Ligand binder design. Structure first.
Ligand SMILES: [Fe+2]
Length: 387
């Protein structure tokens, strides 16, 4: 939007004083933290230290991006004055970023450039903790990485003045954010049963653009991200973003096993809200089956993939257990969800032999481990390791 309500007011009134964001040191961001909290709090690290992140040399610019992914390359740009207008490439767009503000004709924003394809990849690496819990590196069969939700690394490039209205990222994913150059202002809203309600009825009634959802909730936090900060958003959070100055950001969306109920909670919103099967998370329910099969294999040492995939996994490798309540309830959710899908679209992936045997093997594993000691679960390392 930015239509009816004064965004300018929303930016300076000092009233979105909620205290949701937790400030901490990257060293403190280990897997145990996740098992202890379930990545339920948005995090803001000021020093990239301790996070195991790697980013280009600070002077890196927009074209240094468009050189790498090269010009003539089509990019999904959109005029933040309505929607969609992806009629341009890196060539045509770096020629816009450097266009002095006043001359600047339209208002553009590029929030969806996922470069993992391009060389830039081994030039930009996310915090190692995220490499431990990510459902792609650790869940999806390795030899397949389209056929692997290529939605890990992203390059955000915004121009002073753009505003992305309130939304919850796709597939109930979490997201890490590193402002390389510039700054961003966020409006954080918690995925309270109540807020998620208001949020859906808002997506239905039209997202009016006349209502600033931030004012609709009892408490909301407007935070400011500076150059150097790393920002972690947990699944489900409803946020809105505004760019005070031309910025360059590097981040990515991931799924993990400690907040499954919320992730699914969001898919169903995306379902009821008839979201276009375009912006849907790639192979969602298919990733789910691999999740179960990894859990049942890492714990029961009973493989449920096919012989073929089993060989592939073994070849590549050669080149009791106490769960948190988070995973236990989460597994319970994947099981009920998958079981409630009409037979035709249960989206059983390709590497899985018998599905029902799996589900049965999980209902059994979910009852045997029903009593896990929260203390003992805190192993410091995810049980699903070695994709
Ligand atoms: Fe977002």
């Amino acid at each position: 939007g930015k239509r009816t309500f004064d965004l300018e007011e929303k930016l300076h009134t000092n009233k979105y004083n909620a205290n949701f964001v937790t400030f901490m040191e990257g060293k403190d961001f280990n897997v145990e933290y996740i098992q202890r909290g379930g990545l339920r709090d948005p995090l803001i690290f000021k020093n990239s230290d301790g996070l195991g992140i790697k980013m280009p040399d600070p002077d890196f610019t927009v074209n240094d991006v468009k050189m790498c992914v090269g010009s003539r390359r089509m990019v999904d740009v959109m005029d933040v004055n309505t929607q969609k207008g992806i009629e341009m490439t890196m060539a045509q767009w770096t020629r816009y970023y450097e266009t002095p503000e006043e001359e600047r004709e339209k208002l553009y924003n590029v929030i969806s450039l996922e470069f993992s394809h391009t060389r830039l990849e081994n030039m930009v690496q996310r915090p190692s903790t995220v490499d431990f819990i990510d459902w792609v590196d650790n869940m999806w069969p390795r030899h397949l990485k389209m056929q692997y939700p290529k939605v890990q690394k992203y390059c955000l490039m915004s121009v002073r003045g753009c505003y992305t209205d309130f939304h919850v990222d796709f597939g109930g994913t979490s997201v890490w954010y590193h402002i390389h150059q510039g700054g961003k202002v966020f409006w954080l809203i918690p995925p309270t049963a109540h807020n998620l309600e208001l949020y859906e009825n808002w997506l239905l009634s039209g997202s009016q653009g006349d209502i600033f959802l931030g004012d609709r909730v009892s408490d909301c936090q407007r935070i400011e991200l500076k150059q150097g900060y790393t920002f972690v958003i947990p699944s489900g959070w409803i946020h809105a973003v505004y760019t005070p100055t031309d910025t360059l950001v590097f981040g990515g969306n991931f799924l993990h096993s400690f907040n499954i109920p919320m992730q699914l909670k969001i898919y169903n919103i995306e379902d009821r809200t008839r979201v276009p099967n375009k912006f849907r998370y790639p192979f969602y329910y298919e990733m789910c089956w691999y999740v179960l099969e990894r859990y049942v294999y890492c714990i029961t040492n009973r493989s449920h993939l096919t012989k073929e995939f089993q060989k592939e996994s073994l070849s590549m490798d050669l080149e009791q257990v106490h769960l948190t309540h988070f995973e236990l309830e989460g597994l319970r959710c994947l099981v009920d969800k998958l079981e409630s899908l009409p037979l035709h679209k249960k989206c059983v992936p390709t590497g899985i032999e018998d599905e029902d045997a799996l589900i049965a093997d999980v209902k059994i594993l979910l009852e045997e481990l029903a009593n896990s000691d929260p203390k003992l679960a805190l192993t410091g390392v995810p049980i699903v390791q070695w994709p």
